[PDB]
Every structure is written in C-alpha cells, then in structure tokens.
Symmetry: C2
Subunit: 164 residues, 2 copies
C-alpha cells in the first residue's frame, strides 16, 4: 500500500491531469476555498445535505427543493457537492447521490462542479473504492464515477477541494 | 461461483425487484423485443454505436448528432442503449458511455430507458463488474451504475433486454 501522503499526491496528480482544479485545505479554510472557487459567478446549487458551515454570505444559493428545472440548472454558475469516495490511482470521484450530492441531474447539467472530498474519503485502489460504495450499490443507489484516468458531456469545469 | 443459469436468474430477480421490465430473447428476436418495448410511443433516442439490425421501421429514431437539447431529450419517448457490464448480485447495469450508450444526458433525461444487455456481459459479483470496466476507468470514461440493489431522479421506466 502507498502511504497516505503518496495517495494524496497521486490523487492530486490524476485530478490535475484530468484538467480539473485542485486544492487541499483545512476544515477552517473550506468555506473560503469554496467561495474562492466560485469567484464572481456565485449562483451555486447546494444539495440539502451540504453542511451549513461550508456556505458563505454572497453565495447565491439555489436549492433543489422543489426540483430545479433543466433551464434553472443550466443557468446556475456551479453545483457544490460532497462525494462517496475518491480513488487516487485513477483520479476517480464516485458519487452515490446521497443528500450532500443530490440527484444525478445536479452534477450533470451545470457546467462547473465544485466537489469537496474529505481526506479520509480518498483510497488508493479501485478495489477499495468499490468496497466503500458496496453498501450504496446494495441499497440500489445510483453511482456516478467521474475519472481522470490512469457541457454536452457534463461539467466542463471541475474544482476538487480536498479537506482535512 | 454461481452457474450461468443461476446468474441469469439472479439478475432477472434483482431487475424485477428494482421495478424494471425484463426479457431474455435471442439475437434474432432482439429488434422485435425493442419494438415491442416501445409500443406506440416510438420516439427513441439511438446512440450512434447501436447496431443497425436492432432498429426497425416505425421507430422514430432520434440521433444525438448534433446533440439533442434537454427539451428534445425530455420529449423523446425512450432511449435505447447497450451497457458495459451487468452484475447479477445487485441487479446493476454499468454504463461507460461508449458509442452504443451515448453521453450521460441520454440515459438521464428521457423517462424510459431500454437497455440491451448481452448474456456475456452479465457477471455475478461487483468485483467482476469492476474488473470489466477497469479499463474504461483507466481511460477516464465516466461510469453510471444503475442498480436494483441486493423523471426527476432519472428514467422512471426501465426495460432490460438480455440477448443471447
């Protein structure tokens, strides 16, 4: 097994090669990091399970209750989500669409995805990643795997924020 | 390991428990099965890589070149896709959005998904399923895992057609 430091560095490398933005911050720095990532385009879709402390005044928060129309999603500047697990070897982020991630449309239609990944959600191998989401699969939850590897198609911009 | 027969029966059970329709047909029967699944609502989105022989006169074929708008996708009656692999234990179908599956929007926005699964694409375990799509992940292809387990949220209707 790789060390945690090597895993973090590997994940970073793979996310950067994907063409995504990447930053690793402390919990205290997180709200600022998200704010910084949004810049002056602050119309951000926020799934119900995103912790309040991540959010900051000046965000134009869109909520998905009632569900945002395709047009509302397309007009949003960004979507902010957590994830289920991330895999360092392939720079993969897996969503299982729990409350901090929202339904599939929220990370498909908007053009800029800000995805917050806790340091402890990053595993080295695909095998471990699948183990982490096995229960979600058994529950019938959908999974979306977004990968750098070893808009029309989805968000053309991705910011990954590792925290902790 | 389960036998192929037990695997097929298991996959069927899990897909049926998901609330999906399920049929197992021969290759010769496939075009008819797809036609039968569409009924009188024949406006079907067909990814470029779907083999011509699956398609039948009377289908109102929509192509995604140029890309269909959200409204065009929402107005379509169905989308027809292949898949990457299916897992019997969890009734999971994994898409990797190759040419016979199309971009993520095509299986998210329309309300009725007809998904053709070759008998040889069905594996027993999640472990095997991941092995089957590992190369896609390494390539950076997105994966969508649709699962029964052991519209707003996506297609409210799913027809699975196992072939061969």
């Amino acid at each position: 097994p790789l060390s945690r430091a090597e895993i973090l560095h590997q994940f970073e490398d793979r996310i950067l090669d994907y063409g995504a933005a990447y930053t690793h911050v402390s919990a205290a720095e997180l709200p600022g990091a998200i704010a910084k990532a949004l810049g002056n385009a602050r119309r951000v879709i926020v799934p119900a399970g995103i912790p309040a402390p991540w959010l900051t005044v000046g965000m134009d928060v869109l909520r998905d209750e009632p569900p945002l129309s395709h047009a509302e999603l397309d007009r949003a500047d960004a979507v902010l989500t957590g994830c289920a697990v991330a895999i360092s070897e392939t720079g993969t982020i897996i969503l299982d669409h729990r409350a901090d991630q929202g339904r599939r449309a929220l990370s498909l239609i908007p053009d800029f995805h800000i995805c917050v990944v806790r340091e402890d959600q990053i595993v080295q191998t695909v095998r471990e990643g699948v183990e982490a989401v096995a229960a979600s699969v058994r529950e019938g939850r959908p999974l979306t795997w977004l990968s750098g590897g070893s808009g029309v198609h989805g968000p053309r911009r991705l910011q990954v924020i590792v925290v902790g």
